[model samples]
Target: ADQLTEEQIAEFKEAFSLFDKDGDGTITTKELGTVMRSLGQNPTEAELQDMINEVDADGNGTIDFPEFLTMMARKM
Candidate 1:
């Protein structure tokens, strides 16, 4: 985690939690694709799957919110 404010962290957490609709603490490729579609960007199934695979640790084939958040928090 960077030197982010608690408020910002909370906001990120809220957004992430809402995206993980299943409350499985993880965001599946399907969920990510849903979010993309809602944003007016329909990600192909393969693209969605690739994204999850790229970020998922343990190879369970999904991205938990914490893992996603940590990746987002990293400096480019």
Candidate 2:
């Protein structure tokens, strides 16, 4: 059920890199907030933290790409 096409996978990769400001393979909450605001998504701090705590499957305070993939795997 995890299977998806390379086309969408590549696009997801593009998205991860876009937010990984450190190019360090992880998305810090601070980086998440900056990008959210810049995109005019206006995700509040509480919203951001909750989403991280929601999607950060490894139970840490950061989001990594593999786990990020599982996010899309969830109900749309």
Candidate 3:
């Protein structure tokens, strides 16, 4: 896991929430597509599956907040 400060964690949480549309505390490829479209990028199902495979620690086919935060931290 990334060593994020409280503020950074909070900020990332807000961003994650945007993708967690159902408020179920997990993000699926469908949600990722929605957020990506809003950012003017269209991701394919293959791309989404690859991304999830890369970060999904437990192999559950969805990303929880910790996985999302870890991915964001690496980009930073």
Candidate 4:
């Protein structure tokens, strides 16, 4: 939406890089969990499930760059 600003975009990009632990430009469950833990939140299985359910578009057990972008957009 037009409401998103450059600052929001920068934050999302930072979060994206932080979550991409393997530096493969994708976000896996383990990497996402690690990022969550680093943020001081140890997500439970259900919480993790919710994320996978909400963002893992291809359902291959990992989220690609576009899917992660969508999730980060929502986060913004």
Considering every candidate listed, which one attains the maximal lDDT? 3
TM-score of 1: 0.55
- TM-score on alpha carbons, each prediction: 0.55, 0.60, 0.57, 0.56
lDDT of 3: 0.70
* lDDT on C-alpha atoms for all candidate structures: 0.63, 0.67, 0.70, 0.67
lDDT of 2: 0.67
Ranking by TM-score: 2, 3, 4, 1
In the predicted model 4, the residue pairs found to clash are none
Model 2 weakest 10-residue run by lDDT: 32-41
lDDT of 2 at 64: 76
TM-score of 3: 0.57
For model 2, residues 1-76, the per-residue Cα lDDT tens digits are 5676788677777766888777888887556666445434566678777767786557667877776667555522
Best by TM-score: 2
Per-residue lDDT of 34-54 in model 3, one digit per residue for the tens? 654654557688977777678
- Alpha-carbon error at 6 in model 4, in Å? 1.7
State the lDDT of candidate 1 residue by residue for 1-76, as single tens digits.
3666778667666766777766777777556666445535565678666667777646666767666666546621
Stretches of candidate 1 above 4 Å error? 33-51
lDDT of 3 at 41: 58
